[PDB]
Amino acid sequence: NSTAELEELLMQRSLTDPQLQAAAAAAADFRILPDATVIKIGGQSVIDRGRAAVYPLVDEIVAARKNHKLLIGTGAGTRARHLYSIAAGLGLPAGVLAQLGSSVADQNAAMLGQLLAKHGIPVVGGAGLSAVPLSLAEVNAVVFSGMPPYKLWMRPAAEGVIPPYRTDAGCFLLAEQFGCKQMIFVKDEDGLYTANPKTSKDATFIPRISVDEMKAKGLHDSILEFPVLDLLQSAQHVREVQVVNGLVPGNLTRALAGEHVGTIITAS
Amino acid sequence: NSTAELEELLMQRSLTDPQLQAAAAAAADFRILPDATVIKIGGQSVIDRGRAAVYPLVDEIVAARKNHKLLIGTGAGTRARHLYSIAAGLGLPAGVLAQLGSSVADQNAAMLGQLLAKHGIPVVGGAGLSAVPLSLAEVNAVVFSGMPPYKLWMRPAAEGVIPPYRTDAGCFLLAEQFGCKQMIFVKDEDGLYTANPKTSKDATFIPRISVDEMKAKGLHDSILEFPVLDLLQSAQHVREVQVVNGLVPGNLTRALAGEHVGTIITAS
Amino acid sequence: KRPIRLLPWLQVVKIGGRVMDRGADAILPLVEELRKLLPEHRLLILTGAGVRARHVFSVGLDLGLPVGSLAPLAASEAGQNGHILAAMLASEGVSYVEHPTVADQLAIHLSATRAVVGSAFPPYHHHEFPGSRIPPHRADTGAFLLADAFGAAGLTIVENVDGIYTADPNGPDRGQARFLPETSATDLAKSEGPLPVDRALLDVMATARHIERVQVVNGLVPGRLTAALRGEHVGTLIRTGVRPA
Amino acid sequence: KRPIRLLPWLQVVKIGGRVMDRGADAILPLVEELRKLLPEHRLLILTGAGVRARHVFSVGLDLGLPVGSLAPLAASEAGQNGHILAAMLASEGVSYVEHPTVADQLAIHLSATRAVVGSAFPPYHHHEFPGSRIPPHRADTGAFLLADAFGAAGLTIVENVDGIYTADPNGPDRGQARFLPETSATDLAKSEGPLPVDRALLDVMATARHIERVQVVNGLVPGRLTAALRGEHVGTLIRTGVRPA
Amino acid sequence: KRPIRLLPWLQVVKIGGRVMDRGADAILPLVEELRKLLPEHRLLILTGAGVRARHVFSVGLDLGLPVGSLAPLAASEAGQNGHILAAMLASEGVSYVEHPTVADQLAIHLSATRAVVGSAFPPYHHHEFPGSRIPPHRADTGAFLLADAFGAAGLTIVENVDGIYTADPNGPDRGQARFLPETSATDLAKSEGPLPVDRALLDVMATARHIERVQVVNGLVPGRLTAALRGEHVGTLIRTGVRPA
Amino acid sequence: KRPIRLLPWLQVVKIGGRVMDRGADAILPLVEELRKLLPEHRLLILTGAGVRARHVFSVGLDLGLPVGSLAPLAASEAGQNGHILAAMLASEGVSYVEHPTVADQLAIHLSATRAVVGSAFPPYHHHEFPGSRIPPHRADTGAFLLADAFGAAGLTIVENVDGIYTADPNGPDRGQARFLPETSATDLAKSEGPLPVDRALLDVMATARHIERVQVVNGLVPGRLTAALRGEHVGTLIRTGVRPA
Ligand SMILES: Nc1ncnc2c1ncn2[C@@H]1O[C@H](COP(=O)(O)OP(=O)(O)OP(=O)(O)O)[C@@H](O)[C@H]1O
Ligand SMILES: Nc1ncnc2c1ncn2[C@@H]1O[C@H](COP(=O)(O)OP(=O)(O)OP(=O)(O)O)[C@@H](O)[C@H]1O
Ligand SMILES: Nc1ncnc2c1ncn2[C@@H]1O[C@H](COP(=O)(O)OP(=O)(O)OP(=O)(O)O)[C@@H](O)[C@H]1O
Ligand SMILES: Nc1ncnc2c1ncn2[C@@H]1O[C@H](COP(=O)(O)OP(=O)(O)OP(=O)(O)O)[C@@H](O)[C@H]1O
Ligand SMILES: Nc1ncnc2c1ncn2[C@@H]1O[C@H](COP(=O)(O)OP(=O)(O)OP(=O)(O)O)[C@@H](O)[C@H]1O
Ligand SMILES: Nc1ncnc2c1ncn2[C@@H]1O[C@H](COP(=O)(O)OP(=O)(O)OP(=O)(O)O)[C@@H](O)[C@H]1O
Ligand code: MOO
Ligand code: MOO
Ligand code: MOO
Ligand code: MOO
């Protein structure tokens, strides 16, 4: 293996060529923002609930950013479900619903961003990324919309028109792309259970589990978008994630301090 | 000479009028970013060479920006030459080739920018300029694409369709516009020689030379785009430039410290 | 039932970047063929990336950059090929349009003029999927995702080879390479070895909703693109496994 | 004298967000009616916001946000309804266009195609007026400001009710609600109580320069929009108090 | 050989900013003349800056600003004149288009509609050349750079004077000013003294590839622009020193 | 005052029958030039008769037939040349149209398509004037009568020679034939000797109301027709003695 061998294959073979693919796998691995943590703030599970859920999390973000670099992504929530319902009923395809859902995540980022503005924390976009490096350096945090940019090019699910890659996937892929050290999903339950705790009365809490174990237990589509689990098994940089209850005061803070609150889901 | 005389001419004469032109020449001269240095990182001579050339320069940039304010522009390189070749063969004009070359300089700025992001240094654009003042103030450096914005309005050369104003000219004109104190071209040779050192075996190194002397020696089109030499003779603020070898460890650092590495080319 | 077709009268044509890489010798005849097709079809013409993307992958991988950094770098090269092709067709009223315009205003633009040119790469950008160090969702994949989302009448992939063979017909094993006039995406997905189309194209064909077949044809042979847009069999047909309504 | 008319041949149609909120059952017949109108009129179709804006107002007010923060949040929902409606009309050459395009390039877009769709909310954004915690310049108001600035031939407001009544016909007092076939903006402005149109619509009607009357009609009854665009009286006519030149 | 012509059927018309500065008295007849030309020619109409740019140069020079700061300030004024002229032509389907649209999508826009309006100033911006404190690449220069890059059929410069004289016909020496029906760019470049066109226009004419002659005509005389676009000699012809293929 | 112009944006091009008589060698380049002009001009293309009319004059005169019998016989040959030229342009949307359609529906036909082809001979038919045994009102004369009645922007006569000479440049005296770059109809009318244009063309120029000049150019030299339609001087200019309004 060497640079020249890789360049020769890159020139002479299709990118589909297994030999090229394998030489590309041996390339060095640079992490762009290795000291940052990505946090997803759930749309339905947090922001849609208003002040009682959002204000304590704003306070935690403001306290946290003294010792932690944070990229804070927003979910979408009930207005996206309403849009999905209207558009699906008209027969529109998943790529059109994907565009509609992004606007709701953008709304949520704008609302969260306005509560954080006086602390210097911007909503980014516009520039995309490169407002990120300066903001992270100076103010230690930025807010972004969590929906992936695929829009009309969204791959559809096997069945139905709901976009399969939504704001859990968007935030996860940003953590993976930047090589961040940590990915925290902030939801409205303590973590993963053996069943949906809102539907089932005797579900059991799961502190730690791998993707394969989750699949073997029927939990592919539970507290995270199920494609995220497959993205996690493919990831180069973020090989586990943590799901915590944002409605518990201090849970985000304690997760950033290394406490094992919530559920840790591992790629293997 | 007085403000009112200048305003009267500006109202009553064509801008082509020699008397107006001469009163305009006596106006005060404000430098926008007088404490900054513009650095061009060559596309073919540095970035196209990969890690062995770029990583040491990233380290120098990161060390330098503690004591120096830096505007770091990128060249284009071999992918632009490929585009120029395709487009010239189709008969396309210089203004179309100018747009194509800018995209390659943008690619190079994005790659350099990602290696610098964890140090807070952004790639600018989007905002154009006014991401520059804030970034320079806070993080002491910014990365930009070095191609001028002329695009379809590029003046053509006397012969052929290659855009005459490329990334040497773009970086130079930005230094001149901002009134920066220093302009450093980072290439892959120690400086100017009496002949192309890659083609000629007995070329002699030139530590310092004026534009007129270069023309008298047949060196109008050698290590810098030849229009840059004429721009330099017209400049108000940047009346000399330095060409250094970015492949020599520490050369950029030493040039920023005032050491006479490389070649200094003077307007007069 | 399946989603409606947004632009059922649209024909999508993807031009391989390596066709563009051959320069005037390939581009001028293709432009002349496209010119003649403009009064026959409503065309969305999407360009791939070609060899320049291989160069920026070489530099980017040498610098250690992740797959979400390489994806927009390659997409740039497909946009440049699109600007070149559109310039050659400008006098026919054809221009290059950016990805947001394709996603939101294609109908008005194809009402203004007979064809538009855009980039075939999809805007996955820094949200490209991990796993390979080479961006998987490239030009074939983006063009198909678009054509199928629109419910277009067809997608034709215009390459520098006659179609799909059992081995790379320009590669080491080219002597045992047999031409495949017809295949299914599911059979290709189970094969190993290189293809003239993205492997992710086969995955998005499995979830497709409208387009039943995609033809790969040689754009270096005048007349093949014209024949393919009339449904004539002149390259390799790929069956997506959409089944009729 | 009064300003010239910029687009005197334009018809502006504002679609209430709550019509869109009913989903396919309301949208499909309205799309079919719009399809038939495209060869008869040059249309600027502008969508309102509906119930999702009520939800984001509930969240935003619970977070304490000021009226200039709520205004662009509601405007987003009107843009989404516009993207949905335009998608349904894409095969007719109709696309959604952004506010800058409406303000600066509407003439070229209506030369390219028979109708375009945009958001009815005006871009007051963080410069919305203070006083109410609810943004006052909403979809009815923005559509009228545009139609009158252009000197358009008409503005028709398409709602989920027959027109204006003396009380909310879906509200507590619906039993004493009497239908008003005709009214003036000045008489409505002096009434208290709810209306199916923004109160700020009545204020901008008082300073209007061109449009003399605006009809509110039931978009859930096929054929009423068609009849209104021919000047037939099928809902409530609002006289602006522009008087003839 | 020389580059191809991108839009060989295009006519480019540059309107002096000082014509616009005269207000309705000059603009209304010019708009009526442009209206009649729309069915005869495919027009790119580009506006200059006029007196407001002189004011912002006075303020900017008083603040010490360099030539790359003054260039976009003047360009703004040319864009404003373009918005005014386009508004007057809106009912004919004419809109103002931004510089990126001119550079990349002019073909589709001139397929949608008969004429578009843009700014004549080129986007040199903060990369304007140093040497003079007055930006050299102004409206005449930008319009010619565009027309020649496109390989347009012509460029006509519409001014508030009959053409070029031997002295400023509104200046101190106006008594010895003699009209020049024809001249070459090389002869003008060797003269000193003011001109009604940018001196940089003469420099870009020396490197031109397609346009052989440019006519300067009086837009305050109805009918001269019409006659010039048919090649009739009604002002000053400038020979660029392009020589035939 | 003079009559209004009916179609002031029209360009009329008369193609000599003897150009058509040269067959593909002349016709194919001319068709390719016309194809490129279609997006630049609104064209009425009118064909003359050529050598076949000489043959039918020989037969008709041998049978004793009067000038009103020979006139429609020659006109037939101009119609045939028009059908041939239109067929070659059919794929561009060009068709031949009959004399009544030219006289009454040209405006709608030039709204449908960029150019139409008709016969240049006027319908004088059995009411041709007596005096010569050769019909006087032929193709040059009919094309000018039409162009001037319409108030067209120009008439260009496309021949197999560079323009008018002092003697027939293909005749006995061709050695003393001197080229005339410019002349007036009144000076030609006072000369004796042959011309490349009908003598009756000079008579109808004396009563003309709109067209001031007519250019005769060599259609066998690619590019001359294009240049003439932009007013460039590349053949013989004939001044009609219309004087400006
Ligand atoms: N096995 C499980 N354990 C825990 N929670 C579960 C499980 N199965 C389903 N859930 C549900 O998933 C929800 C969390 O996902 P949800 O999509 O609501 O969060 P979100 O991130 O706010 O979404 P968005 O941001 O897309 O609005 C919980 O409220 C819970 O009711
Ligand atoms: N007289 C000379 N002295 C030194 N170098 C010369 C001379 N003449 C030509 N050169 C060549 O010029 C090159 C530097 O210019 P080059 O355009 O390669 O740099 P660059 O800034 O990387 O370009 P870009 O950024 O446009 O890719 C050197 O590699 C050298 O071979
Ligand atoms: N089994 C195969 N059959 C046919 N061609 C193959 C096969 N395997 C590899 N190839 C190669 O695929 C090449 C074309 O795909 P490639 O990605 O290289 O170019 P492209 O489609 O023009 O690029 P882009 O994806 O940027 O548009 C062919 O020239 C051929 O050598
Ligand atoms: N006096 C009244 N007459 C008629 N309708 C009334 C009256 N007062 C209240 N309304 C209510 O107004 C509703 C429509 O206006 P509303 O703002 O709710 O929807 P919309 O116009 O679709 O929304 P948007 O402004 O976002 O477009 C009706 O359904 C009706 O119940
Ligand atoms: N030699 C000359 N011949 C003719 N006009 C001249 C000459 N010298 C100066 N001028 C002046 O040039 C003026 C027009 O050019 P000017 O730049 O002032 O306006 P403009 O072209 O309308 O502006 P812009 O360049 O912003 O479009 C004339 O009014 C005239 O007084
Ligand atoms: N003084 C002259 N100058 C130029 N050509 C002349 C002159 N006298 C005679 N001719 C002849 O006129 C011929 C062209 O006119 P002619 O009527 O023969 O053809 P045409 O215009 O193609 O026919 P039609 O009138 O049927 O269109 C030339 O080929 C030339 O030999
Ligand atoms: O890119 Mo355009 O959006 O031709 O009105
Ligand atoms: O501005 Mo568009 O949005 O050329 O169809
Ligand atoms: O780009 Mo426009 O500006 O589709 O009319
Ligand atoms: O029938 Mo007409 O009368 O093809 O315009």
DSSP string of F175-211, one letter each residue: GG--EESEEEHHHHHH--S--SS-HHHHHHHHT-SS-
Using a CB-CB distance cutoff of 8 angstroms, which residues of chain D are in contact with residue A47? 59
Are the CB atoms for E164 and E22 separated by under 8 Å?
Answer: no
Going by CA atoms, what residue is nearest to atom 1 of ligand 9? E101
Q: How many CB pairs under 8 A join B and C?
A: 69
What contacts E25, CB < 8 A, 6 or more positions away?
none
Could you give the residue ranges of the DSSP H alpha helices within chain B?
A: 3-12, 18-25, 51-64, 78-89, 94-116, 131-139, 167-178, 211-216, 226-234, 251-256
A53 pocket-lining for ligand 1 (C-beta < 6 Å): no
* Atom of ligand 5 lying closest to residue E47 CA: 27
Cβ neighbours for D39, distance < 8 A, ≥ 6 positions apart:
D114
> What is the H or E stretch that residue B245 is in?
strand B240-245
Distance CA F234, CA F157 (A): 12
DSSP assignment letter at B206: E
Query: Among F3, F100, F106, F105, which Cα is nearest to F45's?
Result: F106
Q: Determine whether the interchain pair A133/B127 forms a contact, defined as Cβ–Cβ distance below 8 Å.
A: no
For atom 4 of ligand 9, the residue with the nearest CA is: C109
Query: Hey, how many other C-beta atoms are within 10 angstroms of the C-beta on E107?
Result: 24
Which class for A229: exposed (0-12), middle (13-18), buried (19 or more C-beta within 10 A)?
buried
The residue whose two tokens read 């709109």 is F210
Pocket of ligand 6, candidates F54, F55, F168: which has the most ligand atoms within 8 Å of its Cβ, to mutate? F168
Pocket test of ligand 9: the residue of E44, E83, E109, E113 to mutate, having most ligand atoms within 8 Å of its CB, is E109
Find out whether E77 and E53 touch, Cβ atoms under 8 Å: yes
Task: Indicate which ligand has the atom closest to the C-alpha of A191.
Answer: 1
Distances (CA, A) of E47 to B46, B99, E15, E138: 43, 23, 5, 11
Other CB atoms within a 10 A radius of the CB of residue A168 amount to: 26
Number of H helices, E strands in chain F: 9, 9
Helix (H, G, I), strand (E, B) or coil at D110: helix
Burial class (CB in 10 A: 0-12, 13-18, 19+), F25: exposed
Pairs across A and C, CB distance < 8 A = 154
Beta bridge partners of E156: E13, E215
CA atoms within 13 A on the CB side of A33: 31
CB-ligand 2 contact for B219 (6 Å cutoff): yes
| Chains with ≥3 CB–CB distances under 8 Å to B | A, C, E
Q: How far is the CA of E37 from the centre of ligand 5 (A)?
A: 25
Distance separating alpha carbons of residues B260 and B250, to the nearest angstrom: 13
- Yes or no: say if B46 and B54 are a contact pair by the CB < 8 Å rule: yes
User: Of all atoms in ligand 9, which is nearest to the CA of residue E116?
Assistant: 5
Q: How is chain D split among helix, strand and coil, in percent rounded to 5?
A: 45, 15, 40
Give partners of E (≥3 CB pairs < 8 A).
Answer: B, C, D, F
Experimental method: X-ray
Q: How many helices (H) and strands (E) does chain C have?
A: 9, 9
- Whether residue C108 and residue D116 make contact (CB cut-off 8 A), yes or no, is yes
Distance CA F29, CA F184 (A): 31
- Does residue D181 have its Cβ closer than 6 Å to ligand 4? no
How remote is the CA of residue C110 from the centroid of ligand 5, in Å? 42
Q: Which among D90, D113, D116 is the nearest to C6, CB-wise?
A: D90
Tell me the C-alpha distance between C208 and C212, whole Å. Answer: 8
Beta strands in chain F (DSSP E): 10-15, 42-47, 115-119, 154-159, 164-165, 179-180, 182-184, 213-218, 236-239
The alpha carbon torsion through E100, E101, E106, E110 (nearest 10 deg) reads -160
Nearest beta carbon to residue D111 from set E87, E93, E97: E93
Max CA pair span of chain C: 49
CATH number of the structural domain spanning residue B6: 3.40.1160.10
Cross-chain Cβ contact C84/B87 below 8 Å? yes
Q: What is d(CA D26, CA B14) in angstroms, rounded to the nearest whole number?
A: 63
> How far is residue B112 from each of residues B79, B109, B116, C139, D198, measured CA to CA in Å?
16, 5, 7, 25, 52
Which ligand sits nearest to residue E166's alpha carbon?
Answer: 5
Residues of C at the E interface, defined by Cβ within 8 angstroms: 83, 86-87, 89-97, 109, 112-113, 116
Instruction: Specify the DSSP element, H or E, that contains D185.
Output: helix D185-190
- Chains B and E: 3 or more CB pairs within 8 Å of each other: yes
List the domain range (segments joined by +) for residue B263: 1-268
Question: Which residue, A254, B23, A112, is CA-closest to E57?
Answer: B23
CB contact set of C46 (below 8 Å; sequence gap of 6+): C12, C13, C14, C15, C82, C117, C118, C119, C120, C139, C142, C143, C146
Question: Is the CB of residue D71 less than 8 Å from the CB of residue D125?
Answer: yes
The 3-state DSSP class for residue B178 equals helix
Q: How far is CA F77 from CA A189, B12, F56, F132, in A?
A: 91, 65, 9, 20
- The span from the CA of A187 to the CA of A245, in Å, is 5
Nearest-neighbour CA in chain C from E63: distance (Å): 39
Interchain contact A/F (3 or more Cβ pairs less than 8 Å):
no
Residue whose entry in the numeric block shows the structure tokens 């894409």: D90
- The minimum-distance atom of ligand 9 relative to the CA of E95 is 5
Q: Which two tokens stand for residue E184?
A: 């070459």
Domain at F1-245, CATH class? alpha beta
Closest ligand 2 atom to residue B199 Cα is 31
Residues 6+ positions from E36 with CB-CB distance below 8 Å: E226, F8, F9
Q: Which residues line ligand 8 (CB under 6 A)?
A: C 105, 108-109; D 97, 101, 105, 109; E 105, 109
Q: Whose C-alpha lies nearest to ligand 3, atom 12?
A: C196
Specify the number of domains making up chain A.
1
In this structure, the strands spanning B36-41 and A263-266 are unpaired
